[PDB]
Amino acid sequence: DPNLWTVKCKIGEERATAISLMRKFIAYQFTDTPLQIKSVVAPEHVKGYIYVEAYKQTHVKQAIEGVGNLRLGYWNQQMVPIKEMTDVLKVVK
């Protein structure tokens, strides 16, 4: 199973940035430079970063290259602790 990495994102642009990343993946899916990340999560109340599921940080870097909203997250992504990995998808009400 892959890991999750946090990537700094322009505040308030998390959903738009995720949508740009899927459009990029779809555009490149039949090329020789596909995205190797596994998912992106933008939790309802998270501000200033997104979560990306991938096996390698280098895959994250390559996927997020050129994404303006992630320019401040291009050089460093932080791994989500496995024991806290399910918390990413918790939605309390």
């Binding site: 918390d87 990413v88 918790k90």
Partner: protein, 50 residues
């Protein structure tokens, strides 16, 4: 200990300690709400660090 003196004009300028306590209370309230409601604890962590 942190008198808010007026600058050359009329706006009340706050002391450095006042500004720092303001930042402390901002992150403290943010963390308090993030623990009152399930915030995935990642933000809770980062918040405690800040």
């Amino acid at each position: 200990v942190r008198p808010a003196v007026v600058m050359q004009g009329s706006a009340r300028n706050q002391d450095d300690l006042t500004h720092k306590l303001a930042d402390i209370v901002k992150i403290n309230n943010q963390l308090r709400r993030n623990e009152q409601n399930g915030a995935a604890a990642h933000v809770i962590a980062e918040d405690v660090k800040l």
